[PDB]
Amino acid sequence: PIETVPVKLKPGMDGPKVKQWPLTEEKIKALVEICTEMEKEGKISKIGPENPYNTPVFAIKWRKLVDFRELNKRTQDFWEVQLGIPHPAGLKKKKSVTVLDVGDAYFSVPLDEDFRKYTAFTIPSINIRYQYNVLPQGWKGSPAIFQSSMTKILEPFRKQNPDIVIYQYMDDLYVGSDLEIGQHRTKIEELRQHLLRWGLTTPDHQKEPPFLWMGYELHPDKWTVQPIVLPEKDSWTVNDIQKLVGKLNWASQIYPGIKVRQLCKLLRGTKALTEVIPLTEEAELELAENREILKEPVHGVYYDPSKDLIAEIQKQGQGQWTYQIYQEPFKNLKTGKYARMRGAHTNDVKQLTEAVQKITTESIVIWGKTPKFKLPIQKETWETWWTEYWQATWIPEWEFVNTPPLVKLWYQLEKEPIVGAETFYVDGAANRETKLGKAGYVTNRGRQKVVTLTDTTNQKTELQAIYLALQDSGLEVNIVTDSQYALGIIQAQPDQSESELVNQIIEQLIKKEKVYLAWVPAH
Amino acid sequence: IETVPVKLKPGMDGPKVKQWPLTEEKIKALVEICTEMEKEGKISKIGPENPYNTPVFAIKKKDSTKWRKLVDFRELNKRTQDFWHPAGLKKKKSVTVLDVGDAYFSVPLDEDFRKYTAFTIPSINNETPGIRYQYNVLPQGWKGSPAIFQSSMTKILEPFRKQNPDIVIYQYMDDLYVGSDLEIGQHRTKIEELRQHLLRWGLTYELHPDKWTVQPIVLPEKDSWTVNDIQKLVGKLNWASQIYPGIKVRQLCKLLRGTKALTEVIPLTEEAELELAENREILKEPVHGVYYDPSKDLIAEIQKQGQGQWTYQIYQEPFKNLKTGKYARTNDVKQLTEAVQKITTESIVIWGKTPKFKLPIQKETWETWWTEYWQATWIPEWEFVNTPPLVKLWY
Numbered sequence A: 001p002i003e004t005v006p007v008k009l010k011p012g013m014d015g016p017k018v019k020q021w022p023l024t025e026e027k028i029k030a031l032v033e034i035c036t037e038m039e040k041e042g043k044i045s046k047i048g049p050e051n052p053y054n055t056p057v058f059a060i061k062w063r064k065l066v067d068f069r070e071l072n073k074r075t076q077d078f079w080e081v082q083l084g085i086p087h088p089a090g091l092k093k094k095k096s097v098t099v100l101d102v103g104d105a106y107f108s109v110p111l112d113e114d115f116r117k118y119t120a121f122t123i124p125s126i127n128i129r130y131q132y133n134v135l136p137q138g139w140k141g142s143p144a145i146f147q148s149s150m151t152k153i154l155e156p157f158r159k160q161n162p163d164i165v166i167y168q169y170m171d172d173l174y175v176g177s178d179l180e181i182g183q184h185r186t187k188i189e190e191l192r193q194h195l196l197r198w199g200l201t202t203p204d205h206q207k208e209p210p211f212l213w214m215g216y217e218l219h220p221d222k223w224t225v226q227p228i229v230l231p232e233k234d235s236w237t238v239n240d241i242q243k244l245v246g247k248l249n250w251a252s253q254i255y256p257g258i259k260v261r262q263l264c265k266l267l268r269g270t271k272a273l274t275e276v277i278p279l280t281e282e283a284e285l286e287l288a289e290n291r292e293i294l295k296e297p298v299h300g301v302y303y304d305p306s307k308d309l310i311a312e313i314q315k316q317g318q319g320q321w322t323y324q325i326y327q328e329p330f331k332n333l334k335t336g337k338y339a340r341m342r343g344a345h346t347n348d349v350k351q352l353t354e355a356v357q358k359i360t361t362e363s364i365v366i367w368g369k370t371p372k373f374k375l376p377i378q379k380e381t382w383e384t385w386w387t388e389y390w391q392a393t394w395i396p397e398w399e400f401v402n403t404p405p406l407v408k409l410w411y412q413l414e415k416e417p418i419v420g421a422e423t424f425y426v427d428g429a430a431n432r433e434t435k436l437g438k439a440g441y442v443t444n445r446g447r448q449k450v451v452t453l454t455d456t457t458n459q460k461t462e463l464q465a466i467y468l469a470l471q472d473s474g475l476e477v478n479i480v481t482d483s484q485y486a487l488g489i490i491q492a493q494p495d496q497s498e499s500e501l502v503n504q505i506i507e508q509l510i511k512k513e514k515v516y517l518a519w520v521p522a523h
Numbered sequence B: 001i002e003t004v005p006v007k008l009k010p011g012m013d014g015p016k017v018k019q020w021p022l023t024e025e026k027i028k029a030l031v032e033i034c035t036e037m038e039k040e041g042k043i044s045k046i047g048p049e050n051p052y053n054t055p056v057f058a059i060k061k062k063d064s065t066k067w068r069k070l071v072d073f074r075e076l077n078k079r080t081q082d083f084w085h086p087a088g089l090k091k092k093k094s095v096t097v098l099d100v101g102d103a104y105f106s107v108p109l110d111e112d113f114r115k116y117t118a119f120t121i122p123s124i125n126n127e128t129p130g131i132r133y134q135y136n137v138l139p140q141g142w143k144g145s146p147a148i149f150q151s152s153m154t155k156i157l158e159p160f161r162k163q164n165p166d167i168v169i170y171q172y173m174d175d176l177y178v179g180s181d182l183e184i185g186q187h188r189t190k191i192e193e194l195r196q197h198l199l200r201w202g203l204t205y206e207l208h209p210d211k212w213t214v215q216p217i218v219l220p221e222k223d224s225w226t227v228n229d230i231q232k233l234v235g236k237l238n239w240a241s242q243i244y245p246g247i248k249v250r251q252l253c254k255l256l257r258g259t260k261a262l263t264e265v266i267p268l269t270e271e272a273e274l275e276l277a278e279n280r281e282i283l284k285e286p287v288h289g290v291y292y293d294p295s296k297d298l299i300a301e302i303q304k305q306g307q308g309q310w311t312y313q314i315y316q317e318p319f320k321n322l323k324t325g326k327y328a329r330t331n332d333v334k335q336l337t338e339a340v341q342k343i344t345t346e347s348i349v350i351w352g353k354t355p356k357f358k359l360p361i362q363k364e365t366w367e368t369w370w371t372e373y374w375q376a377t378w379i380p381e382w383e384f385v386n387t388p389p390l391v392k393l394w395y
Ligand SMILES: CC(C)c1nc(COC(N)=O)n(Cc2ccncc2)c1Sc1cc(Cl)cc(Cl)c1
Pocket: A091, A092, A093, A094, A095, A097, A165, A166, A167, A169, A174, A175, A176, A209, A210, A211, A212, A213, A218, A219, A220, A221, A302, B127
């Protein structure tokens, strides 16, 4: 009843020819009985010596099974079905939602006449060659064509009725409206009616909520995540631990409490994938604290296009940021965390800004609009860093919220050398075999100091020199360095780093009143 | 009508590019525009046997409350069979540009090829499959539309230039560059007429090329120099010594001898004043031996200077700029976007090519807001840098 959709094999591929798995009598007879009824319904048809290819058949138990994997390996590619996630919280909450069954509408779609020849299978001598005339079950291109065909049918109806939501998934139709049960019902019948007119008979078993959907549980007034469970093991290999960390990270996206540090330490120096590792006590605790966190399922409400979208961010641990998207106080639509670390050197404002970006993109994808943000950062603060930062940033309209910890600029390097402040010319270098780590300085006032080190690079000694400078000076200092490494690092004005010296220096820089750092080429 | 047969570089296949998410607004606009275009047969919904896809966006050109549909065929263009630039506009005094994308809409597109122009109108939260289409005519933004219309493009330009090679007009994709070194008010008038010279076949502010330059590097002029002042001079001169190796800094560094306070004034010696002056002379002109090379990529770097100030450089060999300039004042983003356009435009003008931009912004940020202030008809290639410009005070 719908225009067949042209189909072809990949560039220069041939159909299947995999010999037929000689089956048994109890088997042959069963299929013989199944093919007969599908035949008398169109779905298939006898073919003869004519056709060359062959897909083996099986009779699962008394159900017909055609192993098409070897014809799906030679069919063109189709426009993917699952374009996008989507998130349960984007769904608009309707008053009534009906679910329609399609089912048998499976064999209810025609296969392109020039492709068919390739769907040839063979039924052994009872003691018979066929081909499909419909989207076979097990054919790479059938889901796509089905959904598409289905889309075409609905397109019209969806037109004459825009206020109705119709989600097509697998063999069902979820239709929601905001009409009254009287009106809703009638519309549905029309739909039932329309659907019939194309050969999609709808049975007049009624699947009820919660609707199990892609790891989600959909209830009328809310959505929940299907329980997330971790494996129970006495012996943990490296493979186990990696997949475990895998699942955890993933699940840490909605369960901000989750930690993986102690479990990932376990991966250190691992010699083999099967190597078994005793769990650390700090690792055992963490694994237990995660099992628990995961006992309370994540859940939220549905979307109300009538109210405004508000997003609230919070500074959790280190580089960790939590966020909630709601319309009414604490009635969360969605919640998450953002913790990426875009580069080695960074600070809190840049991070808060990145988090702000993420939520925007996600909002736009889920609700089609950006939200109003409530951020733990003063206008004064974000504005100073904004016009000082080298990249172009886009801040959205936001409301402050003095809910500690607050995001703040821990410091700002001077822009001009400080008048009257002691000038420190710092320096450092070493021995490549092993350190002659002699870092120290000299000032315009005559003060001088040299410090020897151990187990440290050449740049580490430059950083040391600045640290020594910083620690040994008044509240206002001028530091001249020839290190691009140090300069770069510092000029960025990060407030934290995986380094200890860089960190020490940072707290030093934070303590100071004034600090001008100057670079001069390394002679 | 008969169609011009197009082909993909022998060994290529269509583009399968991801469609960035759009606001409901941009979706709504897009869907209006498309069925109407469908109504007219330009595009017609397509099926799922078409695996290809090209990004599409919705821009609203200002001074009207009308949306325009922009398609990102960048990728398609990179793979359409290799199909086979008038100096003088970069010389003219005032230049103008016009949009001739429409012309193409009246040209059947080669059957076997429409499949590659497939694009998708996205759905909010993916609760709907996504509206699929394909072009039946010559699409805007595709390198193949100009090359195929060429035959009829010049064949419609003669009645203004067969014996009228005084003024100049160049065509870049959907773009029409009309350069005329004539009188200011007497400019609009000579083009407003070409605006009526093509219309006879269907398709119903100025640029100042000659007034550009690969600006010079300038050293400070001062009555008194401080330790720091000199430290900076030496720095900036050092950098500059990779472009110009004749630059010298020995004499100056002599001054940086000892350990004086950063704010202390150091008299310049005669040997030091001479060097600086020779250094000033070397820099008075752009480095020799820097010419455009077609086999190379044109690259453009932008640096935010604060105060709605943005500097940029176009170059092919790093530290061998073909041009430099500045854009000036709104927010970082709007400015950054206007700058890319201004820059791309000059680029098309001077070399008839768009440059690959290195954008000082987070990717996700750009992708979300660039369509907000984009008015061009093309889209340049771009990448995002996360490394501070250490040369923000030198460049
Ligand atoms: C009309 C459709 C679009 C719909 N809208 C809402 C949004 O929910 C409301 N309240 O309308 N719900 C959820 C629902 C669940 C149980 N009862 C009623 C509705 C549904 S049903 C549904 C079912 C599956 Cl398998 C997948 C998806 Cl994405 C949605």
